[PDB]
Amino acid sequence: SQPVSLPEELNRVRLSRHKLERWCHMPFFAKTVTGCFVRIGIGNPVYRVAEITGVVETAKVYQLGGTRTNKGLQLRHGNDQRVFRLEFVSNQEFTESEFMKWKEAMFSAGMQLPTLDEINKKELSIKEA
Amino acid sequence: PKSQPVSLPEELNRVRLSRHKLERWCHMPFFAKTVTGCFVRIGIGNPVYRVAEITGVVETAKVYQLGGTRTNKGLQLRHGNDQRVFRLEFVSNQEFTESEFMKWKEAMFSAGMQLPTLDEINKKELSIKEA
């Protein structure tokens, strides 16, 4: 029941752009990525912590590394909910500053933080054997 | 009354488009028809902003990130007699300040331009309503 307190903890359910590229044509892509988090580039360079709350189709097909996709992630950062192309997800870990700004957004939004149980159950559910 | 020219920033803010709204709309049909005649709070450098009317939408040479998407579009923007093209990434999400609004009126009057009426504002606002 302990709320997430450390970047290391939330990193257990962080998806890189690499993983997202590898998975983006898989049949259960939405089920897999929903409830995970990303380090998302939001433009100039600023990155944020965001939860994936769903997958949508984008207006345009675009290049993602070695493939092409029209998938977009529905991303939540506190009250902020927007669709982002997969191309803007970072391969790097959350910085401590990014993680702390996110916790502030959560509390200021009156949104309950994920628990370590919720994080561990999600991490386990999508392990690839 | 609706025949009066605009005189308050609250009135002009009825047709102000946020950067987030521009991002949401930028790849939908009739984007230029929708946004033309709206206003933006445009960032012009150091941070300073201007009130500007959108007079059209153009292609630019720079493909850039606009939130969750990519675009090369530019806004043709007018502030009194000053007309320029700006990337949409420079539009502010914040409301016009009273000083920005007053500076814009000063530019309009200097130029000999007349301000929109409340009727014109209301008609534009009603035409951009999301349902």
Swiss-Prot record, chain B:
It is found in: Nucleus, Nucleoplasm. It comes from the Eukaryota. Residues 6-131 form the Plus3 domain. The Plus3 domain mediates single-stranded DNA-binding. Component of the PAF1 complex (PAF1C) which has multiple functions during transcription by RNA polymerase II and is implicated in regulation of development and maintenance of embryonic stem cell pluripotency. PAF1C associates with RNA polymerase II through interaction with POLR2A CTD non-phosphorylated and 'Ser-2'- and 'Ser-5'-phosphorylated forms and is involved in transcriptional elongation, acting both independently and synergistically with TCEA1 and in cooperation with the DSIF complex and HTATSF1. PAF1C is required for transcription of Hox and Wnt target genes. Component of the PAF1 complex, which consists of CDC73, PAF1, LEO1, CTR9, RTF1 and SKIC8; the association of RTF1 appears to be less stable than that of other subunits. At least in HeLa cells a N-terminal shorter form of RTF1 is also found in the complex. The PAF1 complex interacts with PHF5A. This is RNA polymerase-associated protein RTF1 homolog. The gene is RTF1. The chain holds residues 348 to 482 of 710 of the full protein.
